[PDB]
């Protein structure tokens, strides 16, 4: 269950 939200 990793953090999936995009980054820069």
């Amino acid at each position, epitope marked *: 269950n990793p953090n*999936a939200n995009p*980054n820069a």
Partner: antibody, heavy 127, light 110 residues
């Protein structure tokens, strides 16, 4: 109530661009992410990309990376999707859907799921 | 490329059915970020199952999800006529990307 309202139907020529909007209301806008998904007539759902409503960071699908731009306007609590160089097979219904967002300070149990969907916007590409 | 679902599944009222969703070792097999969506013709999809086996508020306990290896499965108990719809699975694919399944059409006989 919690809802996402999208803009109306679009009719475009091959090679044009289209920009669909998705206005949020009823919840804290910058606490979530927002997907854009499309569905050709009689076909399956296809993920295009998503954006963090807060910091605006995006990730697009490898099939659309060259043609799609997803943006957001926090002051209007609205997300936008622009698809360029339209072609015949881009004719589909386009949906916006809300999902979870976790920041840096979030150790939390990360779960996801497109829990709220817009009504959909039809885009018709024809000469 | 997408996740492989059966094209159609059929059942009669009261019967239970199961819809498969086969992925790879890069999506369904690794992450618990697996969701199921119900879509009636012409309407927006509706989240039925998230995090493999969890239901949102109000969703009937007739809908259940599970995962074994690379294949996620959605079970619908006590089949009713209102369950006739297209059902889609979706999985995290790494690198902040998501992938949808091909879709399954559920028909209720009788």
């Amino acid at each position: 109530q919690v809802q996402l309202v999208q803009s109306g139907a679009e009719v475009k020529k091959p090679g044009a661009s289209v920009k669909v909007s998705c206005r949020a209301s009823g919840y804290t806008f910058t606490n979530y992410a927002m997907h854009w998904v499309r569905q050709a007539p009689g076909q399956r759902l296809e993920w295009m990309g998503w954006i963090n409503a807060g910091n605006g960071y995006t990730k697009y699908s490898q099939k659309f990376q060259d043609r799609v731009t997803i943006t957001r306007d926090t002051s209007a609590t609205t997300a936008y999707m622009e698809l360029s160089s339209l072609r015949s097979e881009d004719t589909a219904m386009y949906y916006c859907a809300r999902d979870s967002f976790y920041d840096i300070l979030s150790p939390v149990y990360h779960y996801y799921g497109m829990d709220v969907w817009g009504q959909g916007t039809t885009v018709t590409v024809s000469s | 490329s997408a996740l492989t679902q059966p094209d159609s599944v059929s059942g009669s009222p009261g019967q239970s059915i199961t819809i498969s969703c086969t992925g790879t070792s890069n999506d369904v097999g690794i992450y618990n970020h697996v969701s199921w969506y119900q879509q009636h013709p012409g309407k927006a999809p509706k989240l039925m199952i998230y995090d493999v086996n969890k239901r949102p508020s109000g969703i009937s306990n007739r809908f259940s999800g599970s995962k074994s290896g690379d294949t996620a499965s959605l079970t619908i108990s006590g089949l009713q006529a209102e369950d006739e719809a297209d059902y889609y699975c979706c999985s995290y694919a790494g690198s902040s990307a998501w992938v949808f399944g091909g879709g399954t059409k559920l028909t209720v006989l009788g």
